[PDB]
């Protein structure tokens, strides 16, 4: 469907978050899950799938527990060769009731039939206090791509280039990423909820719907504001 743009006072303010911004930042830092053409090898709960993906640096294999908002999504991708790309975590990563066992949400696309021979550019338009000063491209080889994956590439870029989640040097109070596909749009709040704690597991669960977009159609807008 479509989604109303943020009402005034709806967006999370970093000034009102008194925890570690570091714990938001690590999620969009260099480390992430990206595997190509793999199939689930196990499952813990009915709403998840477990992949075995290689670590090139240490030579071993790690397990990734991918979590979806329901059984239907897990059921869909279960015995399928896929691509997995997402912002993973460890703190409340459960394989039962730890570098080799990471968790994530969504980030899964069928491998076969989703490959372009030539990559597509998707331009991100960064607005700071209403002004499109920065724009940059992210390139994908996927026809249908998770919003998660685009969100990651976008924020990573911003973290490194614009100090996005620098606890001390970030200029930004407010932040949302808006995805536009035809006339329909949705957005995510890029800032942690107020108070003194931040739950990595809970924040990232917004990707467990596995939302996909078309990489030729989607436009990305990021709206930041300064303090």
């Amino acid at each position, epitope marked *: 469907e479509s989604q109303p743009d943020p009402k005034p006072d709806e967006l999370h303010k970093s000034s009102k978050f008194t*925890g*570690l911004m*570091e*714990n938001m*930042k*690590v*999620l969009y830092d260099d*480390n992430h899950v990206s595997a190509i053409n793999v199939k689930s090898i196990d499952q813990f709960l009915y709403f998840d799938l477990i992949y075995s993906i290689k670590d090139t640096k240490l030579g071993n294999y790690d397990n990734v527990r991918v979590e979806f908002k329901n059984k239907d999504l897990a059921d869909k991708y279960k015995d399928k060769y896929v691509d997995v790309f997402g912002a*993973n*975590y*460890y*703190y409340q990563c459960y394989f039962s009731k*730890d*570098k080799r066992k*990471t968790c994530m949400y969504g980030g899964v696309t069928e491998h076969n039939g989703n490959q372009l021979d030539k990559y597509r550019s998707i331009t991100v338009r960064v607005f700071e206090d209403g002004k499109n000063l920065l724009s940059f491209d992210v390139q994908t080889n996927k026809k249908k791509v998770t919003a998660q994956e685009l969100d990651y590439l976008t924020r990573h870029y911003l973290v490194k280039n614009k100090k996005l989640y*620098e*606890f*001390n040097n970030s200029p930004y109070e407010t932040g949302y990423i808006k995805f536009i596909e035809n006339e329909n749009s949705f957005w995510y709040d890029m800032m942690p909820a107020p108070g*003194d*704690k931040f739950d*990595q597991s809970k924040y990232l669960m917004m990707y467990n719907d596995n939302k996909m977009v078309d990489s030729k159609d989607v436009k990305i807008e990021v709206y930041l504001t300064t303090k």
Partner: nanobody
Amino acid sequence: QVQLVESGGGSVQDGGSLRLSCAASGFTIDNRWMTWFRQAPGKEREGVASILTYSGRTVYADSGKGRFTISQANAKNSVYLQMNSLKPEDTATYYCAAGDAYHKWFMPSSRALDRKEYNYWGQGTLVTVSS
């Protein structure tokens, strides 16, 4: 195995200054809290300063406020404690401790000065301050 070796201690007069070093080996300074403690004879170990190496964020106990500064040198795999306006009260053995390296997570600052959190401690360096 993890090792922490402190240096830069010594014997000074009220108002003096020292710089403590801690060389770590067996692990990197990265992505953890590194912390300076001190212990008078017969008192418990107390936290004086900590730095989250991921971000350079710092926590200071009331005792060193306005007087001490903690810092890191990633290239040297070491942390440092600048100690200024020393006073006889600061006479303690000073210890460097390494916080745990959690995967993509850092423990809240409220616990950085708690000794119970730390599994890796150096020998310590003595600081004495004449009145």
